[PDB]
Ligand binder design. Structure first.
Ligand SMILES: *[C@H]1O[C@H](CO)[C@H](O)[C@H](O[C@@H]2O[C@H](CO)[C@H](O)[C@H](O)[C@H]2O)[C@H]1NC(C)=O
Ligand SMILES: [Zn+2]
Ligand SMILES: [Zn+2]
Length: 355
């Protein structure tokens, strides 16, 4: 009743809001056997992974909330859809269709909604391409505060780390679920620093979907700073999330280059508390699936207005190899919204930036 991988687990702070878990079934789709137990186990270990990383970065034993209905069992919403599986494929807006339909279900059942974040899980298609040994066919990506992942018969934590085909399949699809969940929890892509790579392995939001459960995987300081401001990590029930717009005035921005150091400073002002500053440094190009290389850094602010100052060591920018690079400054607000300002430089014509 408790798998070995969960015998080592920490007590977590109760949260104000919980991630919804939906097991989403096409009108013609059969559940994968034993999914309540298998998925509860995988989700609780996932909750442990995020909570231990939050703790290791100084936030205490905080993870995303889950609605737990009895020991070791997540209260998973089993949703029978209006249409057959074919109507919600990986391609062509299948994920938007499922997610819009679940909105109707949550309007019709507000008691089942515990936050604005949902992980929708669909059983693998079984056809000439996909099946138990090669799952796929369904949405598998982040979509706003929602994210999509899949289930298949060997999707079972007992295979975690085993040097077998089931174990390798698990790291692929469990790492996959972990990464897409990161997106649903307001995480962008980021790459580990050089020192963090040697200490802790692969950033989950970089290439960690290939490593989770097999070699060391972790959450960066910047990832944890965003989770710190994510609705389902809240231990503060008075705090409302995602309403309105990010309002931050950033002024007196300076970025200067001195020897090996990158100096970043400025001031900020917001009607909300500004929790933190994340900095992303990356090579071009800069699109949303071309930023696995953005090496991130983070600093605690914690005021509605003030100054920020930060020295970044150039030698930590592991993997960057372009003459051209971009520094992004990300201001994270207490209600989970954020704003970004971007700056482009060239290493062979490095120009300090002012104003
Ligand atoms: C990214 O890695 C994932 C595992 O970590 C996974 O392989 C994903 O691939 C998609 O999986 C979907 C599951 O329904 C579909 O089968 C889809 O066709 C397939 O590409 C990987 N993404 C990409 C873009 O390859
Ligand atoms: Zn991604
Ligand atoms: Zn890039």
């Amino acid at each position: 009743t408790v798998p070995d991988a969960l015998k080592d687990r920490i007590a977590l702070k109760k949260t104000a809001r919980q991630l919804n878990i939906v097991y989403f079934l096409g009108s013609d789709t059969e559940p994968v056997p034993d999914y309540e137990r298998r998925l509860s186990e995988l989700l609780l270990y996932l909750q442990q992974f995020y909570g231990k990383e939050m703790q290791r970065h100084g936030y205490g034993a905080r993870s995303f909330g889950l609605d737990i209905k009895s020991p070791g069992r997540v209260n998973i919403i089993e949703y029978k859809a209006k249409n057959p599986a074919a109507h919600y494929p990986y391609e062509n807006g299948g994920g938007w269709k499922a997610a819009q339909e679940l909105d109707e279900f949550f309007k019709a059942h507000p008691d089942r909604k515990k936050s604005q974040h949902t992980l929708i899980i669909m059983p693998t298609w079984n056809d000439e391409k996909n099946g138990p040994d090669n799952p796929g066919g369904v949405p598998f990506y982040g979509m706003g505060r929602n994210c999509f992942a899949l289930d298949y018969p060997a999707f079972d934590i007992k295979h975690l780390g085993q040097k077998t085909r089931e174990g390798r399949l698990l790291t692929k699809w469990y790492g996959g679920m972990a990464h897409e969940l990161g997106h649903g929890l307001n995480l962008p892509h980021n790459h580990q620093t050089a020192s963090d790579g040697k200490k802790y392995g692969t950033a989950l939001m970089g290439s960690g979907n290939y490593t989770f459960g097999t070699s060391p995987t972790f959450l960066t300081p910047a990832s944890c700073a965003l989770l710190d401001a994510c609705e389902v990590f809240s231990v503060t029930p008075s705090q409302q999330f995602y309403e309105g717009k990010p309002e931050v005035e950033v002024g007196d921005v300076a970025i200067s280059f001195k020897g090996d150091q990158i100096l970043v400073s400025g001031n900020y002002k917001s009607p909300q508390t500004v929790k933190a500053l994340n900095v992303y440094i990356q090579d071009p190009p800069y699109a949303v699936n071309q930023d696995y290389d953005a090496v991130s850094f983070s600093r605690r602010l914690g005021k509605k207005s003030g100054k920020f100052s930060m020295k970044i060591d150039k030698k930590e920018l592991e993997g960057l190899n372009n003459n051209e690079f971009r520094i992004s400054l990300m201001f994270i607000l207490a209600n989970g919204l954020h704003m970004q300002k971007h700056f482009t430089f060239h290493w062979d014509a490095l120009q300090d930036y002012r104003d």
